[PDB]
């Protein structure tokens with residue numbers, strides 16, 4: 374059972390967030406949540422499909438990452454009875470460990486996928502999907518959007534995202550991945566930036 378594995382992996386991440394995300398007391402793990410989601414969007418860029426990424430700090434202290442790539446495949450996976458996107462959002466395999474870590478450590482996560490003319494949406498709570506991915510509407514755009522509300526059971530002390538921390542790494546990432554265009558917007562004060570290196 375994939376379902377059994379999935380919940381074991383999630384539970385493994387909650388019990389040992391240090392080895393997956395970093396220190397949970399000093400801010401580093403909290404911001405590493407953003408960078409992990411961002412790194413997935415960059416993969417879609419490196420793969421040649423995404424060109425703009427927008428990172429938003431929301432005023433309710435969640436962060437969203439939007440890409441204009443293909444959008445995570447929505448097809449019920451041939452292997453596990455749920456959408457391929459749910460697999461990517463929930464399956465652990467530190468070998469092959471990725472964005473499930475963020476899902477596990479978020480009190481809530483919102484996933485919106487635009488592809489093949491359709492908008493698909495799923496909500497997760499502590500990594501657990503409220504329902505299967507479902508079509509909520511129609512669109513002519515493509516891409517993936519992950520917004521996450523970090524668990525305040527997991528994170529102490531530094532619980533609010535810092536603009537400058539996110540600006541510094543995003544600037545570095547566009548530098549290292551020349552050609553990727555990344556926008557950062559703060560909804561708390563209206564501050565924004567655009568990082569591209571060519």
Ligand SMILES: CNc1cccc2cc(C(=O)Nc3cccc(C(=O)O)c3)c(=O)[nH]c12
Pocket residue numbers: 410411413414417438439440442443444445446461472517518519
């Ligand atoms: C903010 N953005 C994102 C956050 C978190 C995860 C992903 C995953 C993906 C992806 O997995 N994209 C992809 C698209 C089409 C095909 C395949 C495939 O492997 O067959 C993969 C992506 O594009 N953005 C992401």
